[PDB]
């Protein structure tokens with residue numbers, strides 16, 4: 001079919017940022033090809049039929065950023081609530097303040113530690129390694145929170161989530177979490193955050209709203225690309241699906257994690273009194289439980305029912321959609337081969353690669369969007385509007 | 394010009410300055426604000442601690458919050474607000490507790506996680522020890538509401554320190570100030586809008602007094618200057634926000650108030666307690682709370698190696714003390730009744746209105762004081778100033 005100026009594979013925040021930018025800022029005709037039956041990638045939301053409560057289909061999505069560029073951009077498509085994310089950690093039958101801060105320290109060690117007292121305590125317990133010298137997840141984690149807290153709140157959660165030796169996981173995984181010596185327990189440390197007032201799916205649909213954008217759901221790129229590109233040969237492609245799958249796993253399989261969920265409607269108005277409860281112990285199969293009513297107190301939610309979602313992690317087999325890049329040293333070697341294939345495909349077939357799946361990177365929503373805005377301004381727009389090379393100067 | 398005052402306002406706290414600003418800017422009236430202290434703002438006055446430069450509140454820590462959008466929109470004319478949300482922690486038997494009482498405190502104190510339903514059931518059954526109807530005092534009523542363990546831990550001795558009044562003889566609404574939750578929400582206030590003034594309270598207050606039609610007299614006692622000022626401006630009403638009993642020479646007796654003492658101290662550490670306010674719920678320390686002011690403004694560049702803290706002590710307001718909180722004994726409410734009659738008669742004969750915390754013997758938060766002043770303005774003072782309407786009501 002035609003006519004299109006640009007193809008985008010995948011309708012997550014990366015793909016839709018590209019589509020919206022090309023359509024509105026250049027007046028380009030965009031075709032977005034989505035294999036799932038819905039838009040939005042893993043950020044897709046939908047109502048639970050019984051309660052009418054909006055659920056994040058793939059587990060809680062919390063938006064946060066310190067990038068004002070991004071904040072201004074996304075506010076063109078949605079309003080945000082004043083929500084600030086806080087997570088509690090269940091360990092040995094007790095709910096703990098989390099992440100690292102004077103709350104967690106005083107609870108776990110059984111009495112109040114002042115900022116200076118806590119700094120001294122953790123410094124002793126972390127002394128087996130300095131943070132600068134840390135070379136993997138386990139080392140970095142211990143260097144920041146100390147061995148006792150590492151063993152209680154990090155080690156077993158990480159084992160459930162990754163089922164991978166912590167000495168072979170990336171150090172940057174732990175630096176996602178704030179590390180504090182105050183009573184501050186905000187899960188993020190960014191300037192801006194909140195939840196979309198009308199929900200994620202509305203926000204995503206608003207990004208795809210321009211008349212120059214066409215979205216085709218339930219369509220696999222690899223089934224339709226040859227005839228699509230033949231009819232529109234000038235159009236480049238932005239691919240946001242799994243990187244290894246694009247090349248038919250020719251350089252080996254990257255390790256990914258996937259998730260399963262159990263959604264349950266309960267006959268109580270409030271199951272756990274907080275949106276997300278982490279379960280840090282090996283004795284329960286799920287990593288955390290989401291209770292979505294707490295994300296939108298402003299809505300007309302029932303007061304005698306609630307929807308919760310248990311989250312279970314496992315390896316992405318060949319049958320599964322991947323959710324998390326694992327990035328072991330072995331993975332990173334396979335990734336290097338795929339990055340080489342990707343750059344070749346960009347030069348030859350005018351296919352760009354982006355997003356969590358397209359680049360095998362642990363990307364939050366705001367980082368995917370920043371990345372797409374950059375790709376559009378610096379690489380794609382000059383190609384589309386002056387015929388500049390996708391192999392940039 | 395100067396003088397030819399249309400309105401006298403006694404006191405330059407948030408109530409008085411709201412009145413003065415509204416009369417000036419909305420009605421074009423000339424206002425004289427008479428203030429006995431050497432600065433405006435009443436107890437909300439802020440200033441920098443000299444050694445650290447950190448902005449402190451010498452008359453007590455002040456946290457702004459409101460659920461009234463009209464009040465919010467009004468105060469934002471004079472200041473911007475940070476995104477600060479107040480949280481308080483409670484020190485008991487050497488441990489820091491999440492506070493106010495919610496799933497955090499419940500889980501910490503009772504030693505395991507309680508779900509919303511489990512916590513509701515727990516509190517209900519412990520509270521069942523005493524029937525609220527049969528409660529003979531503060532202690533029994535507190536127990537009948539939250540149960541004996543929570544009462545004996547976080548309310549009993551803290552209440553004893555701050556009021557030194559029989560808990561059975563204190564207003565029930567006092568505890569209503571704290572939100573009560575079966576969630577993990579520990580945001581101290583329940584109000585829609587809050588934050589700290591970006592340039593501090595004193596700048597906010599100065600902006601309220603900025604209109605050229607407002608003249609302010611500092612270091613001036615209304616009772617020293619009123620006769621000749623009113624003789625020169627006989628038509629001008631008076632909005633009095635000083636002490637109600639002092640106004641009438643304590644003729645009906647003296648109203649009971651609590652006062653606070655403060656000890657400001659600069660410490661050679663960048664962070665003393667990692668949070669703005671720590672309550673001390675136990676009898677083994679004499680102060681009720683410690684404030685650490687750097688945490689009121691994280692957005693500012695404060696010293697990395699010093700901090701200013703302020704210990705708070707509560708006692709009876711003796712004759713030379715500043716009154717902070719009304720005690721409201723039955724003898725007090727009776728004394729108040731007599732003064733309320735005096736006040737109404739004075740409104741009728743002398744065109745004096747009584748307002749604010751001191752003027753009405755009523756504790757008032759800032760947002761309450763501002764709302765009260767806006768209401769007085771709309772219903773009583775502005776129609777009087779604009780149309781000659783009567784100041785007499787109810």
Ligand SMILES: Cc1cc2nc3c(=O)[nH]c(=O)nc-3n(C[C@H](O)[C@H](O)[C@H](O)COP(=O)(O)OP(=O)(O)OC[C@H]3O[C@@H](n4cnc5c(N)ncnc54)[C@H](O)[C@@H]3O)c2cc1C
Pocket residue numbers: 009010011012013014015033034035036039040041042043058059060061062063064219220221222240241242259323324354355356357363364365366368
């Ligand atoms: C469990 C989970 C929790 C998360 N929580 C947060 C959070 O709290 N805060 C935050 O900021 N971010 C969070 N994220 C990240 C977020 O979901 C996205 O990864 C982020 O928005 C990046 O989007 P993306 O477009 O790069 O990838 P995706 O959202 O995965 O979109 C890629 C799209 O490509 C589609 N696709 C794949 N192959 C094909 C094909 N052959 N043909 C057509 N379409 C194809 C896919 O169906 C998918 O829709 C979470 C992610 C996951 C998995």
Ligand SMILES: Cc1cc2nc3c(=O)[nH]c(=O)nc-3n(C[C@H](O)[C@H](O)[C@H](O)COP(=O)(O)OP(=O)(O)OC[C@H]3O[C@@H](n4cnc5c(N)ncnc54)[C@H](O)[C@@H]3O)c2cc1C
Pocket residue numbers: 403404405406407408409427428429430433434435436437452453454455456457458613614615616634635636653716717718748749750751752756757758759760762
């Ligand atoms: C320790 C303390 C802590 C507080 N903490 C908070 C808080 O966290 N959040 C919040 O919202 N509110 C708080 N408040 C309330 C806050 O101070 C309000 O702004 C205040 O109640 C406003 O009411 P007001 O203007 O009538 O009182 P005031 O602020 O007391 O002003 C009355 C003024 O009248 C002056 N005056 C009295 N007699 C005379 C006289 N004869 N002649 C001339 N002038 C006179 C006084 O000097 C004073 O300046 C606190 C109050 C106190 C005392």
Ligand SMILES: O=c1ccn([C@@H]2O[C@H](COP(=O)(O)OP(=O)(O)O)[C@@H](O)[C@H]2O)c(=O)[nH]1
Pocket residue numbers: 089153154155157158161173174176177278280
């Ligand atoms: O209670 C927790 C939370 C996080 N993590 C570790 O920190 C990483 C990042 O945590 P995040 O909360 O960012 O994970 P996501 O929500 O992206 O799955 C996890 O993969 C774990 O390895 C942990 O060990 N315990």
Ligand SMILES: O=c1ccn([C@@H]2O[C@H](COP(=O)(O)OP(=O)(O)O)[C@@H](O)[C@H]2O)c(=O)[nH]1
Pocket residue numbers: 483547548549551552555567568570571672674
């Ligand atoms: O840890 C606390 C905090 C408050 N209160 C009671 O609740 C009242 C209201 O507390 P607030 O924090 O509102 O007091 P303020 O800041 O006005 O002095 C206090 O007077 C006490 O009687 C208590 O018993 N324990």
